[PDB]
Amino acid sequence: SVVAWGGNNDWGEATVPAEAQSGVDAIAGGYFHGLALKGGKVLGWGANLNGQLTMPAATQSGVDAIAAGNYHSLALKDGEVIAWGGNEDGQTTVPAEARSGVDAIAAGAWASYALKDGKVIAWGDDSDGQTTVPAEAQSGVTALDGGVYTALAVKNGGVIAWGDNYFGQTTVPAEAQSGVDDVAGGIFHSLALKDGKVIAWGDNRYKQTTVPTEALSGVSAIASGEWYSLALKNGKVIAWGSSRTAPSSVQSGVSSIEAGPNAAYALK
Template sequence: MTVSAAMALSLCASPASAATVGGVIGWGKPDFGVTVPPAAALTGVTAVSAGTTTVLALKGGVVLAWGANNWGANEVPAAALSGVGQIASGWGHELALKNGTVLAWGNDWYGQTDLPASVTGGVTAISTSYMHSLALKQSGQVVSWGSRTDVPAAAQSGVTAIAAGGDHNVVIKNGGVLAWGSNVYGQTTVPTALSSGVTAVSAGFQHSIALKDGRVYAWGRNNYGQATVPDAALSDIVGIDAGANHNLAFKSNGDIIAWGSNVVGETLPDPPPCGPVFAVSAGDSDSFALKEDPTTPC
């Protein structure tokens, strides 16, 4: 059953969890075993990032990878086996951030792993999408490489958060959302309400979402209802992530909210995943979350 523009799934009403370390759960597209995390990813994980066919997890500074191994996406380099602080999975290319330096491996068809010199130090955040990546420097400057290298003057300073989309980018500057790239579906036409007070952004294939005062805002392409925010995501949201054509969010009590495309159960799985969760990541046609104990029965 496809989730329509007016529907969303509120999964697992559960007590709040203060966990910051847990295990990965996954649902949606079963291809390449991506939704079945390896044993190593069932405990001690602090972050998860879903790409198109490969999933990354961060455990004690070590990067774990599973799914398809196209272009060597699952072959984690030695440098990413310790001291890593952030991860980002793309279209068969993978990123990690270690001591302010970006590491990259996998698909390089569009220069996704051909790192510019400016990201070999002083980087505080990373984000990647299908064919390009972003990095945020300590100075607040955004750096872009791969199929998109353009960064507007307004994003050369003062930026505090970044998100790479399929054909566009969104960032936070001075609490407001700044966007650039393709605007065929209005994905870079930012709602006026997002000029201040924004705490998180995420970019999908051709849509974007933002978090402000516990409420999710969405704009851009809406062919699967991905830009129509359900009532459940209008309050008490603490985390968000946009996939290709669907979105995930979670509330302060660990409930998961999912909406948009449901071609392979990425938003409305049967049976539903069980929370509470403390992080989410939406991929191409799959979804992932971190929960304190992923083996706990629902």
């Protein structure tokens, strides 16, 4: 089971197809499209504006992980990062260094990230610095996420953030400098998960940073879209920012969350 909600659905990126309805191991939401991972095979739905739904033959089996950006799709297979769709910003051109050894991947709106041997490798758009990986994130990194103009990482329990900082979304609070488990980037806010509590900093004009009480403890997972966020707590999804709420279908029994730019997804 899969539940998708949120946003206008102008492209059907939130209309989950049947083959993607169960036995799905992972979902990834891009701006115009969705990706799912099912028994090693990558499935997609939405508008193939840029080639992001033209699946490379290598992605039809043995894929370990997926990510999705505005124009592109990413897949991690046997340590190799595979990328397809739009390359307007170099986000689809995989560095040689990222063709083996890689443990994780993430997608920013117009950038791609890989965590390989404790080191963040980044390509794609750098007009806000989001591809310029700070020295501290070149070893010991255990989690990463891309935002629209930002990217985040966890190293030695502490958050690292680079790219745009107009609203202070890249200024790590002291509370997030240890004990951190995971991170997420919105367009103008950031989240960290530390000891079951969600920490949120940056823009709060749309309440992005106004963490609901229920999310200040017991939280097992987080995710951020552009202007909203998600937290998973004992099988229940909590959502906030830009008037985003979470439907009754996701109030229990939820095993994973995933936040696309607009649409949220929960696997049940």
